[PDB]
Amino acid sequence: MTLHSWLDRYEKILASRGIKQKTLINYMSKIKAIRRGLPDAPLEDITTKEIAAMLNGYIDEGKAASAKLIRSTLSDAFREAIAEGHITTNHVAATRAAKSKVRRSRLTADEYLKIYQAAESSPCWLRLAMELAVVTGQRVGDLCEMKWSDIVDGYLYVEQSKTGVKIAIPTALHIDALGISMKETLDKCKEILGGETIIASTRREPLSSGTVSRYFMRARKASGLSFEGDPPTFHELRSLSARLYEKQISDKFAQHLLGHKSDTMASQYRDDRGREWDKIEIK
Amino acid sequence: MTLHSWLDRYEKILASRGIKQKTLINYMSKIKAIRRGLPDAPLEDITTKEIAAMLNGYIDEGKAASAKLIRSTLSDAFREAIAEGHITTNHVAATRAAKSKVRRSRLTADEYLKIYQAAESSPCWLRLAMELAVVTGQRVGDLCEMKWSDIVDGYLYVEQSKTGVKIAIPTALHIDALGISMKETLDKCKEILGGETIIASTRREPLSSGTVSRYFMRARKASGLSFEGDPPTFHELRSLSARLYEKQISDKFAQHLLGHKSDTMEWDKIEIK
Amino acid sequence: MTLHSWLDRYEKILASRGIKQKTLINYMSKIKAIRRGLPDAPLEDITTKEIAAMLNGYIDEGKAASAKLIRSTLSDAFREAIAEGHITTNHVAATRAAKSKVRRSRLTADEYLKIYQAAESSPCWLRLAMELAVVTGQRVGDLCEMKWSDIVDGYLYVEQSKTGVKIAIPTALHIDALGISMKETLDKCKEILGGETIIASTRREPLSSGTVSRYFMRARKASGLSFEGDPPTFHELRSLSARLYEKQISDKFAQHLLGHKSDTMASQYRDDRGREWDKIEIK
Amino acid sequence: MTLHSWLDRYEKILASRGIKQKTLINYMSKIKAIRRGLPDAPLEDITTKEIAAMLNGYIDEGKAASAKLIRSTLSDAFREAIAEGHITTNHVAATRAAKSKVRRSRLTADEYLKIYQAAESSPCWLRLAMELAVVTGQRVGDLCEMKWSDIVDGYLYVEQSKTGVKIAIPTALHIDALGISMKETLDKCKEILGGETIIASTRREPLSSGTVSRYFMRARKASGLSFEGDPPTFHELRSLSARLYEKQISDKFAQHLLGHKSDTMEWDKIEIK
DNA sequence: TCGTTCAGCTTT
DNA sequence: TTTATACTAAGTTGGCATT
DNA sequence: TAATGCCAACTTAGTATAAAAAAGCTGAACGAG
DNA sequence: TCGTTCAGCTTT
DNA sequence: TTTATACTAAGTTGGCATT
DNA sequence: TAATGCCAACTTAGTATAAAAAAGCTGAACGAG
């Protein structure tokens, strides 16, 4: 049939995949792009060349990431059109997914200390959010949803929203390199913040993970540090955590703590992407 | 030749397949849905487009589960047709399978107790069945056919109808959370129920599994409980059983009692090691 | 091109896959069958119907196993013809692999005892081969290649020929159910057999695993036992071993001993295929 | 347009790709093999049959490794052509990749020692390089560029040219099996070799990695040793290093020293548990 | 009888 | 070797029927 | 009556397989005793 | 300022 | 989530060349 | 001379990705102070 008409149908299909809200939002945005990019002509007649032209359009503006996702979504949409008997061949499969390297810079312990310090004039919860993150290795989304009720007998219970992974973290952790004590930290969060969520606003209410990430970014700018390519973000406290615990305790610990069943993912958080010189220990 | 003339030939093939009556019946029904869902056109002319159109018709009515099974069958009949070369291509293959999350809700020990209470208006066998179903964790079809002679020197022998699994359950088991003694439950059965089968109708004869199920369902409604997704069914007493024994004794045990030939059917403590 | 000509070419390809000798022998036999079964016509023109006809031919003689393998080999041969630009579509893929259930009957401990006893008038090594097999769970091929030099400090070292799996078996094993002691058994093999291979001939030479299997079969017939479908074979001492150790020690032990990384395989050796009633233990 | 007119366009694309000179050179060579292996016909007319024919030509000469890489490149150039729609289909895709087992043989500590002995007729730097290569486990290209200034407070800093990995090796390591002291080996280097790079030519200047390799190869022959499959090469001193450290210290350590961002590059004791 | 290889099948 | 899928054989329940 | 079955159209749930590779099984014919 | 949602991008 | 494959960037060495 | 490089055509070896799903990042515009 026709592309835009099929994309209308395609959305409905997604509405039935049982994917999470954020996932659907992401997909919708890719389709919207596909609508502006490609004509409303018979699917059978949409050429690899035309598809190629658009993607290159995004690649040329430096939006390789966007290109790669858009290409994926279109592709899958064709696979569904094929699965419903409209097309018969995937004109996208012949394309090559745009190759792009991660621009975001990793964060070194020192940088963390400068920022942590720069976050002086920031809402009291920032520093706390920061410490809790590095000492636990949990994503910010999960971080901001932890409730005091998830702590039972010295262990903090976490069910990662993104992966479903379940872990019990001992409140006895410590980041010797940064002088951070999980327990001491949770105690400052209990008094100074007091809320049902371990991390809370000045009004004792839970925060949106986007806000926490937003303030980290400001404190970062407030630090005056410079980086190659893109700046480190809040999420980077996760690899930092992994790399720090790596050298302090062990690979496996880092791997279990971050909730990485796979090694492809673990060896990735373990990478500093050239930020520093790895001083090899005879351990 | 034609779709329907073929569905006709296809049936007779299945009949020779060597499967159980129920399976065959399951198949026949899928075929009929196809008969009422597609034209009696030449196999060669039946489009993926058309097939999907039918398969979506079911999905739209939320009958995803059925869409999947009908698709499955359709493809099988087409393959058989290609074997006999009535066609060259299987147009069902390009179609995707509707994925569907089970909606049936689980049963918690508190609810069981609550349901057991509403059972009072029910025949006495409903309760004994429920109790027996949680303590022995067997399928309803297998419960309904247990005979007193299957018990020997403290063991209830069961050859599961669905999978052929053969097990010997020790008549000493006991569900702690619900206070059920397989010995006491069996005893009540022999004195109250009277018949050659452990579970038995008022007419002192074996009960149909469709009935046990149906009467439990009555009690469930009668209890007024509410659930998310579809309501728990008699078959859920088997999962409550699995889960309970899982904790009381062991996960390994829950498996052997239910009799799964696999391990196919959580919280990681992080040690500072 | 032409089928028989392509099959000639196809063999060469296999000669380059780096597969083991036995594997190549198996493949050759499937091709030979494909040669008798199908004409020497253009690949493009060999119909699913013709392919179907042959396979059904084998299925009707009760050689479902043969059908399924033959179908596989042909299929792969088409995939290679397709990969070299002769054909373009796999006329076999549309076929359905013949469905067949294992005919070989499992072996119960009692049956093992009757046979073991029946193997009285058998060469002294049989009984030994039998005990060593059940107490170790190793395949007969590996069994007959074990050298006294593979035992170091109470552990028997095994590198499975078929899988590459490596395990060190403690000479301290015991099959309480059959009254079999690995150590006692290895000792009888040392004196009574004396050879470089732990299992040896009356002339102190290694045996072919086919022979050991052959004598077990005779002792079996000599036992007078009857079975549904096909009789148990020597290999069945492996599942027996697994099922026995299952109830005596644990699932995992059985799983590690037999060298099964996967659970699909482990839960399979664990199955008795209806031979007996599984008396459930409260463990 | 035509295969060769395209290979021409294709090259300029690769040139803009942002890869290292050596990579680009690797690519150019594959292209030339293609130029001499296929007609300068219209892309549309180039068959899978033909491509395979060429790819097998290499396989037959036992150059499987090359067959694979040429195929890989060919497909990339075709994809780029489809992007610009000079074609609709990639006829390389249907072709399969030649799988090839590495034939190069490993190096054992006894052989290293034996080779080290034949090295006596070789420049003094060959030995120091060998020693340095086993104790530091770095790639030959990275060894040849180590400067004395990369050492600070007991650490040799290395930024691996191939992968960008940055490491600080402690100048206290020691290979037991071969009696090598990184401290003593470095010391011999400064007194005997003289130059800004730790390893250095007679002319007191940096050596090419192709040379170190080539002279080790000479010694290997000169030693008269024999191996299965191809003979071990200088790069094998890195594996001997990995393996030795694996046992002496730890597998984890062997990994960090070689600097692998992964764990990608045996005997299970059975406990009666 | 003790033992081995070739073949066409079945299992893992 | 293992995850997704194809086969199998249930179990669930509204309506109408048998006892 | 109530207590129970049976049909039918749905939804669940237990197992075996896929792919390739590499065994294992055992009738025959053969070799040294 | 403390905080939140919408969007179009980048990462995991 | 993970195994196979596509990209990258070496390293190996015979011949011929530079110093 | 020897000691070393350089080209070229091969063989090896280190990493990032695939697929889909589900985040995370942060400019804007907006809301209560």
Short mmCIF file of C-alpha atoms in Angstrom, two decimals, chain C residues 93-283:
data_model
loop_
_atom_site.label_atom_id
_atom_site.label_comp_id
_atom_site.label_asym_id
_atom_site.label_seq_id
_atom_site.Cartn_x
_atom_site.Cartn_y
_atom_site.Cartn_z
CA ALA C 93 13.45 -25.52 3.10
CA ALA C 94 9.73 -25.73 2.21
CA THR C 95 9.78 -29.37 3.24
CA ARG C 96 9.03 -30.51 6.80
CA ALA C 97 11.63 -32.58 8.66
CA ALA C 98 10.16 -36.03 9.39
CA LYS C 99 9.13 -36.28 13.05
CA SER C 100 10.40 -39.35 14.93
CA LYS C 101 10.63 -40.39 18.59
CA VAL C 102 13.61 -42.31 20.03
CA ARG C 103 12.96 -46.05 19.80
CA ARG C 104 15.81 -47.16 22.07
CA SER C 105 14.62 -48.23 25.50
CA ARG C 106 16.29 -46.89 28.66
CA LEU C 107 17.97 -49.27 31.11
CA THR C 108 16.91 -49.79 34.73
CA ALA C 109 19.33 -50.69 37.52
CA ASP C 110 17.85 -54.17 37.84
CA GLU C 111 18.21 -54.86 34.16
CA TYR C 112 21.79 -53.75 34.50
CA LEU C 113 22.29 -56.34 37.23
CA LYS C 114 20.80 -59.16 35.20
CA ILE C 115 22.97 -58.30 32.22
CA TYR C 116 26.03 -57.78 34.34
CA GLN C 117 25.42 -61.24 35.59
CA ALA C 118 24.68 -62.63 32.15
CA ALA C 119 28.02 -61.25 31.08
CA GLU C 120 29.58 -64.05 33.08
CA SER C 121 30.73 -66.06 30.08
CA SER C 122 31.89 -62.84 28.42
CA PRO C 123 35.51 -61.66 28.17
CA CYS C 124 36.63 -60.39 31.54
CA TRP C 125 36.81 -56.80 30.32
CA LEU C 126 33.08 -56.47 29.63
CA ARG C 127 31.96 -56.38 33.24
CA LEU C 128 34.75 -53.97 33.92
CA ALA C 129 33.89 -51.79 30.94
CA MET C 130 30.33 -51.81 32.25
CA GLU C 131 31.19 -50.74 35.79
CA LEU C 132 33.65 -48.06 34.73
CA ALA C 133 30.99 -46.62 32.40
CA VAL C 134 28.16 -46.29 34.91
CA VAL C 135 30.46 -45.04 37.65
CA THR C 136 31.97 -42.41 35.34
CA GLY C 137 29.19 -41.55 32.91
CA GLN C 138 31.66 -41.26 30.05
CA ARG C 139 30.81 -42.32 26.46
CA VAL C 140 32.20 -45.65 25.27
CA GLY C 141 34.44 -43.96 22.73
CA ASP C 142 36.18 -42.03 25.50
CA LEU C 143 36.02 -45.01 27.81
CA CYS C 144 38.15 -47.21 25.56
CA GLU C 145 40.82 -44.53 25.16
CA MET C 146 41.52 -43.76 28.81
CA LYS C 147 45.18 -44.46 29.63
CA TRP C 148 46.56 -45.13 33.10
CA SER C 149 48.62 -42.04 32.46
CA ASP C 150 45.50 -39.89 32.67
CA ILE C 151 45.17 -40.53 36.40
CA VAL C 152 47.05 -38.05 38.56
CA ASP C 153 46.59 -37.72 42.32
CA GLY C 154 43.31 -39.58 42.63
CA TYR C 155 41.66 -37.81 39.71
CA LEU C 156 40.93 -39.38 36.32
CA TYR C 157 41.38 -36.84 33.55
CA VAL C 158 38.97 -37.01 30.63
CA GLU C 159 38.81 -34.97 27.41
CA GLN C 160 35.65 -36.03 25.60
CA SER C 161 36.33 -36.76 21.96
CA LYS C 162 32.83 -35.84 20.85
CA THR C 163 32.58 -32.51 22.70
CA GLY C 164 36.03 -31.37 23.80
CA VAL C 165 34.72 -31.07 27.36
CA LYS C 166 37.48 -31.51 29.99
CA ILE C 167 36.86 -32.99 33.43
CA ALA C 168 38.82 -34.46 36.32
CA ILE C 169 36.92 -37.31 37.96
CA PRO C 170 37.75 -38.18 41.56
CA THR C 171 38.60 -41.87 41.85
CA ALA C 172 36.48 -41.79 45.02
CA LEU C 173 33.11 -42.26 43.32
CA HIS C 174 30.61 -44.91 44.29
CA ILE C 175 27.28 -46.15 42.94
CA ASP C 176 25.58 -47.29 46.11
CA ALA C 177 22.63 -48.61 44.14
CA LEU C 178 24.70 -51.13 42.24
CA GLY C 179 27.39 -51.65 44.79
CA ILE C 180 30.01 -50.27 42.44
CA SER C 181 33.18 -48.58 43.66
CA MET C 182 35.18 -46.69 41.05
CA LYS C 183 38.41 -47.25 42.95
CA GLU C 184 37.77 -50.95 43.50
CA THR C 185 36.90 -51.15 39.83
CA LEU C 186 39.99 -49.39 38.60
CA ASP C 187 41.98 -51.81 40.76
CA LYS C 188 40.43 -54.87 39.11
CA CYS C 189 41.24 -53.27 35.72
CA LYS C 190 44.88 -52.80 36.75
CA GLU C 191 45.51 -56.42 37.70
CA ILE C 192 43.04 -58.44 35.64
CA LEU C 193 43.57 -56.34 32.49
CA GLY C 194 46.93 -54.57 32.73
CA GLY C 195 47.35 -52.40 29.65
CA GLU C 196 48.24 -48.81 28.82
CA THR C 197 44.54 -48.21 28.34
CA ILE C 198 42.53 -48.68 31.52
CA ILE C 199 40.21 -50.96 29.54
CA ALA C 200 42.18 -53.55 27.63
CA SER C 201 41.91 -56.79 25.68
CA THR C 202 42.94 -60.21 26.92
CA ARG C 203 46.18 -59.54 25.07
CA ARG C 204 46.56 -56.31 27.05
CA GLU C 205 45.71 -54.18 24.02
CA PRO C 206 43.17 -51.35 23.66
CA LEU C 207 39.77 -52.33 22.27
CA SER C 208 37.57 -50.70 19.68
CA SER C 209 34.51 -49.07 21.28
CA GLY C 210 32.41 -50.88 18.71
CA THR C 211 33.53 -54.24 20.09
CA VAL C 212 32.77 -53.35 23.70
CA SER C 213 29.35 -52.22 22.55
CA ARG C 214 29.02 -55.43 20.59
CA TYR C 215 29.70 -57.69 23.55
CA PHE C 216 27.35 -55.79 25.82
CA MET C 217 24.65 -56.47 23.26
CA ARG C 218 25.38 -60.20 23.36
CA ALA C 219 25.36 -60.36 27.14
CA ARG C 220 22.09 -58.50 26.89
CA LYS C 221 20.59 -61.16 24.60
CA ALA C 222 22.09 -63.75 26.91
CA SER C 223 20.03 -62.25 29.72
CA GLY C 224 16.70 -63.16 28.21
CA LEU C 225 15.15 -59.79 29.07
CA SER C 226 12.41 -58.28 26.89
CA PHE C 227 11.77 -54.63 26.10
CA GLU C 228 9.21 -52.47 24.36
CA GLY C 229 10.55 -51.25 21.04
CA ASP C 230 14.31 -51.36 20.62
CA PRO C 231 16.67 -52.82 23.26
CA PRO C 232 18.93 -50.76 25.53
CA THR C 233 22.46 -50.43 24.22
CA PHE C 234 25.81 -49.80 25.82
CA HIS C 235 25.34 -46.07 25.54
CA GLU C 236 22.36 -46.36 27.86
CA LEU C 237 24.74 -46.91 30.74
CA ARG C 238 25.25 -43.15 30.48
CA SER C 239 21.69 -42.08 31.28
CA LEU C 240 21.55 -44.80 33.93
CA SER C 241 24.64 -43.29 35.46
CA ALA C 242 23.07 -39.86 35.26
CA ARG C 243 19.75 -40.97 36.74
CA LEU C 244 21.41 -42.97 39.52
CA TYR C 245 23.81 -40.23 40.55
CA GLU C 246 20.87 -37.83 40.28
CA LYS C 247 19.07 -39.48 43.19
CA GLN C 248 22.26 -40.33 45.13
CA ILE C 249 24.17 -37.05 44.97
CA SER C 250 22.55 -34.27 42.96
CA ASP C 251 21.35 -32.91 39.65
CA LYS C 252 24.40 -30.69 39.23
CA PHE C 253 26.84 -33.45 40.00
CA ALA C 254 25.20 -35.66 37.35
CA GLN C 255 25.33 -32.70 35.03
CA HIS C 256 29.00 -31.92 35.58
CA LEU C 257 30.07 -35.55 35.52
CA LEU C 258 28.52 -36.28 32.16
CA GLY C 259 30.06 -33.11 30.75
CA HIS C 260 26.86 -31.30 29.86
CA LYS C 261 27.25 -27.55 29.76
CA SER C 262 23.57 -27.23 28.67
CA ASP C 263 20.42 -28.10 30.60
CA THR C 264 18.54 -29.30 27.53
CA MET C 265 21.00 -32.18 27.38
CA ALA C 266 21.17 -32.73 31.15
CA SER C 267 17.41 -32.91 31.69
CA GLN C 268 17.43 -35.38 28.82
CA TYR C 269 19.86 -37.91 30.25
CA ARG C 270 17.84 -37.46 33.42
CA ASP C 271 14.73 -38.83 31.68
CA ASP C 272 13.89 -42.53 31.87
CA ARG C 273 11.33 -42.34 29.13
CA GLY C 274 8.62 -44.15 31.09
CA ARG C 275 10.73 -47.11 32.18
CA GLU C 276 9.90 -46.69 35.88
CA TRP C 277 7.92 -44.90 38.56
CA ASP C 278 9.85 -41.98 40.00
CA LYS C 279 9.57 -42.26 43.79
CA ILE C 280 9.59 -38.62 44.90
CA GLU C 281 11.88 -37.81 47.83
CA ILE C 282 11.36 -34.92 50.21
CA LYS C 283 14.84 -33.50 49.65
#
